[PDB]
Design a binder for this molecule. Structure first.
Ligand SMILES: [Cl-]
Ligand SMILES: [Cl-]
Ligand SMILES: [Cl-]
Ligand SMILES: [Cl-]
Ligand SMILES: [Cl-]
Ligand SMILES: [Zn+2]
Length: 753
């Protein structure tokens, strides 16, 4: 324990080879027994605790492990279990899984999955009723207490991590039988349950608890933020551990007044995202409260600059004293891959710039020792050379050249306004009124794709297999009589990795898995440098699909903002600069598609709202502006007769931003008074006419009446006819009938003209 302690806010639990996914999925399909699942959990926790102890981390977390989601874990522990999950005599591990994955696997719905702030993790929404009885569920045991005791038996003193009451309630929602319930009003009922838990943790031997209150980086209603004082007045006492109120991902300053007189033992703040909040946040400390300074990024894969991170910490030190500063990860390392050392195919120069969760443990320790005065000179020197090698690999380290060298409006504008383009597109494609199309995906080829990865087939044979599947999908759309076709994207794994693995300025990993939801993990690409496009990324398969039909075939691309958001970004330049470079890369792909005869092109940005900055203000309004501008740069090089499409199904869509794209045609998921939101849409628009989830083939008449309802709002000149989203989750027969009814409905309308 150095004078200045080191701290980790959580550790990824998935395992270095995805052991957690393997044993959990095996348990669901009735392979693994309950004991084997629990033994694997125990073994992961032990390994991870020991890894952190061996690296020298002073404050090591417990309760950060989960078989599914830590928020779900708290719902189970506090008995926030809707009544429908208790009716099948399920063991507690199965109640957890039924809430997480859904009840249908136990019957004779899952809870809502929600983004965790602006990370790429998702949690299971706490759901509350007037009938909810909050109590400590000793049924299974008490997860925090049992896992604290497990670590202690191993000779590892840990700090339990729990999501705090205010955040837990605020992030939850009223169940359907209680739509009047304001979750925050439940605080008096849930606080005694937190108190009992905290008492039990003190009794087990915990000296300090990390109590996460991240909603403090959000714009909080007064009815919510005015409660921090009475919540923590109630929790703090001599019978519970010291409480470290922990925030991350943002700026708490706007909420400072709410937490300026809390009886807690100290705070944690994110000084990676918001280093500038230091002065103000430090000023609220009283009574020997401690400041945990988050300076090792828990959400990115870059070696930390030890000189710069040490200097931020040294400012904290100057402000509250060495005995009251802690060096910490900025957030849980849940959001980074487990271990860089399992990567064997990375360029050696680039691998030297990275640090994954396991390596971050060494980094916080190095920084804590640095400011404490210990000799880590060798590590500082190595680190200073890595940082320099990295800064020298981009066009300029200088922000003056960097700010100036990054979009003239011309680059972001088509050559003519839509009405003029429409005249040329009509003449080129001769589409009728109510033209029909689909969004992209069709029912699925699994084997052969894996065989080609395994080396069992050659590229030529894989190519022949891709081409037969494209052919089958194209011919099926022709038989149905759709007007604008898609190729089914059989060649693509994932709409981001497919691009991230081809673009310049990117690296990709073999094992760089991060948990996204439950047992579903992602392996995000990494932007390491200035981005450009080195080859034709999608042209081959599109040109093949277009060569077998006389109907127009959509090219299909992912837009720049979505590639950026589903990748690990550079931490040395703005997101804006990266999006614009990605925009210019995609512009070359679009221009190539067009040049190869693919003149109808869909460019999809499903991650927009996900990347929305957490507070209303300047960063948010800039984001929307540059987000749109990036899309326009990608799409504005084309001739007037080339038709740009874009599809939108991504939760709470912003029609103002959609309008800023100047896309020729948009499709919008749609199947109460919602049609009015897009009533002023300027170009062409296809409001989805059926729900690709709903379990029923809509009749022709059902299509006809839905088209009639839309025609009360839109002109027929603007209207495209298409489903809500892709069809890969349906069976072929339901897809044939649905789409056949859709086209026949369309034709009826054409005739009535
Ligand atoms: Cl159990
Ligand atoms: Cl705003
Ligand atoms: Cl407009
Ligand atoms: Cl009408
Ligand atoms: Cl029109
Ligand atoms: Zn969709």
């Amino acid at each position: 324990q150095s004078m200045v302690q080191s701290s980790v806010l959580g550790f990824p639990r998935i395992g270095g080879q995805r052991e957690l996914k393997k044993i959990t999925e095996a348990y669901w399909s009735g392979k693994a027994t309950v004991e084997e699942l629990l033994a694997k959990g125990k073994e992961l926790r032990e390994h991870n605790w020991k890894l952190q102890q061996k690296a020298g981390v002073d404050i090591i977390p417990s309760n950060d492990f989960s078989y599914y989601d830590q928020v779900l874990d708290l719902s189970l522990l506090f008995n926030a279990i809707p009544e429908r999950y208790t009716k099948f005599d399920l063991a507690p591990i199965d109640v957890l899984f039924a809430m997480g994955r859904g009840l249908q696997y136990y019957a004779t719905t899952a809870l809502e999955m929600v983004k965790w702030f602006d990370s790429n993790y998702h949690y299971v929404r706490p759901t509350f009723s007037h009938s909810t009885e909050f109590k400590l569920n000793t049924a299974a045991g008490i997860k925090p207490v049992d896992e604290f005791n497990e670590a202690k038996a191993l000779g590892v003193q840990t700090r339990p991590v729990i999501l705090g009451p205010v955040s837990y309630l605020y992030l939850g929602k009223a169940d359907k039988d209680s739509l009047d319930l304001e979750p925050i009003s439940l605080l008096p009922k849930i606080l005694p349950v937190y108190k009992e838990l905290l008492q039990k943790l003190k009794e087990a031997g915990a000296e300090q608890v990390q109590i996460d209150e991240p909603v403090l980086v959000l714009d909080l209603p007064e009815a919510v933020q005015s409660k921090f004082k009475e919540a923590y007045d109630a929790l703090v006492g001599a019978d519970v551990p010291e409480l470290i109120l922990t925030t991350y991902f943002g700026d708490v300053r706007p909420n400072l007044k709410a937490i300026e007189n809390l009886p807690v033992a100290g705070f944690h703040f994110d000084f990676v995202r918001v280093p500038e909040q230091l002065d103000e946040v430090a000023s609220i400390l009283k009574d020997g409260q401690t400041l945990s300074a988050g300076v090792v990024d828990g959400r990115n894969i870059w070696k930390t600059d030890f000189a710069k991170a040490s200097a931020v910490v040294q400012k904290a030190i100057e402000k509250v004293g060495k005995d009251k500063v802690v060096v910490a990860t900025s957030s849980s390392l849940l959001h980074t891959p487990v271990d860089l050392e399992s990567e064997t195919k990375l360029d050696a120069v680039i691998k030297d710039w990275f640090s994954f969760a396991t390596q971050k443990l060494d980094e916080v320790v190095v920084i804590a020792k640095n400011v404490s005065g210990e000799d880590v000179s060798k590590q500082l020197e190595a680190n200073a050379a890595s940082i320099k090698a990295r800064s020298e690999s981009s066009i300029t380290n200088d922000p003056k050249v960097q700010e100036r060298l990054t979009i003239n409006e011309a680059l972001a504008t088509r050559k003519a306004a839509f009405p003029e383009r429409l005249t040329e597109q009509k003449a080129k494609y001769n589409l009728p009124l109510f033209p029909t199309t689909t969004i992209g995906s069709f029912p699925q080829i699994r084997i052969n794709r894996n065989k080609f990865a395994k080396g069992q087939i050659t590229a030529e044979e894989y190519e022949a297999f891709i081409n037969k599947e494209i052919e089958t999908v194209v011919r099926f759309q022709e038989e149905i009589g759709l007007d604008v076709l898609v190729h089914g994207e059989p060649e693509r794994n994932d709409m981001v990795q497919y691009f991230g693995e081809q673009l310049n300025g990117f690296a990709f990993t073999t094992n760089g898995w991060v948990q996204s939801y439950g047992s579903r993990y992602v392996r995000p690409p990494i932007i390491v440098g200035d981005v450009s496009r080195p080859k034709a990324m999608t042209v081959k398969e599109s040109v093949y699909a277009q060569s077998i039909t006389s109907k127009p075939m959509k090219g299909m691309l992912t837009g720049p903002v979505t590639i950026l958001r589903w990748s690990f970004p550079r931490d040395d330049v703005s997101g804006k600069i990266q999006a614009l470079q990605l925009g210019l890369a995609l512009r070359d792909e679009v221009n190539d598609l067009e040049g190869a005869g693919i003149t109808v092109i869909q460019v999809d940005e499903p991650a927009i709202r996900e990347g929305l900055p957490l507070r209303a203000g300047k960063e948010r309004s800039d984001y929307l502006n540059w987000a749109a501008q990036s899309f326009r740069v990608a799409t504005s090089g084309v001739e007037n007769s080339t038709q740009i499409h874009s599809h939108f199904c991504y939760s709470d869509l912003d029609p103002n931003h959609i309008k800023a794209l100047d896309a020729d045609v948009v499709s919008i998921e749609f199947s109460p008074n919602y049609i009015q939101e897009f009533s002023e849409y300027p170009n062409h628009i296809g409001l989805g006419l059926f729900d690709i989830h709903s379990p029923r083939i809509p009749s022709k008449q059902e299509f006809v009446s839905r088209i009639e309802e839309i025609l009360k709002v839109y002109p027929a000149s603007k209207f495209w006819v298409n489903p809500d989203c892709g069809l890969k989750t349906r069976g072929w027969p339901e897809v044939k009938e649905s789409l056949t009814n859709m086209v026949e409905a369309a034709k009826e309308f054409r005739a009535k003209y």
